[PDB]
Amino acid sequence: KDEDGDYEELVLALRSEED
């Protein structure tokens, strides 16, 4: 139910699994 994509964009930019 994301009202827009700003939060998603930030999260994806900050995400890291690969050390």
């Epitope: 139910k1 009202e3 939060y7 930030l10 999260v11 890291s16 050390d19």
Partner: antibody, heavy 116, light 113 residues
């Protein structure tokens, strides 16, 4: 605005069990890692657990103090994350918060009191 | 275990003056990608924690001008240029470079008068 809401806390006997719930509104839960964080006067803020997405095979990580007793889970279709707490100790007393992946969104918290 | 240390339990500020709040880690928080994996939070009394700063020096959305974050790899500083009354509460740093994520003990801001 995004809203996270915890429920399930209360008074519970030592060694007993209690399952916490966190439901998300205006928040596409399936896209984001979720965390549980707790707070007590004695220990401050403590990160408890995390669960990732269906695609990283719902990978979980736990605080050492909690490993083996707590289980974090999620149900994307119910827009919810859970914390199953078994063999509760007095140390586990505190306010339990649910948070999203980057700690912008926090619930109001639910109070867990472990005493006889 | 990365230990997060906030030396000052509390700090007094004259309203409208600046303040700095320190935090240090027992290990460098500098990720290989060049980013420093450090959060700053404010917890106003009776409220849930609220994010102020991510990756050591970035203002989170909706956070006021007067807040800034800086630091090296192990020493970090949160600064407020002109303390509003809405700024009082407890400030926490947190590292998410490694599991377990760990918090500092917090630094309580209080107004002078």
């Amino acid at each position: 605005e995004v809203k996270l809401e915890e429920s399930g806390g209360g008074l519970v006997q030592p060694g007993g069990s209690m399952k916490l719930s966190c439901v998300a509104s205006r928040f596409t839960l399936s896209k984001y890692w979720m965390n549980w964080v707790r707070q007590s006067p004695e220990k401050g803020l403590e990160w408890v657990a995390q669960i990732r997405l269906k695609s990283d095979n719902y990978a979980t990580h736990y605080a050492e103090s909690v490993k083996g007793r707590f289980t974090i889970s999620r149900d994307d279709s119910k827009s919810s994350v859970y914390l199953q707490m078994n063999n509760l100790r007095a140390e586990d007393t505190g306010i339990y918060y649910c948070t999203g992946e980057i700690f912008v969104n926090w619930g109001q918290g639910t109070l867990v009191t472990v005493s006889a | 275990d990365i230990v997060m240390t906030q030396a000052a339990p509390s700090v007094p500020v004259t309203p409208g003056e600046s303040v700095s709040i320190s935090c240090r880690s027992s290990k460098s928080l500098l990720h290989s990608n060049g980013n420093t994996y450090l959060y700053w939070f404010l917890q106003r009394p009776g409220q849930s924690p609220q994010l102020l700063i991510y990756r050591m020096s970035n203002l989170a959305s909706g956070v006021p001008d007067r807040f800034s974050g800086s630091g090296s790899g192990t020493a970090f500083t949160l600064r407020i240029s002109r303390v509003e009354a809405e700024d009082v509460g407890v400030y926490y740093c947190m590292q998410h470079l490694e599991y377990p994520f760990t918090f500092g003990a917090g630094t309580k801001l209080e107004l002078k008068r």
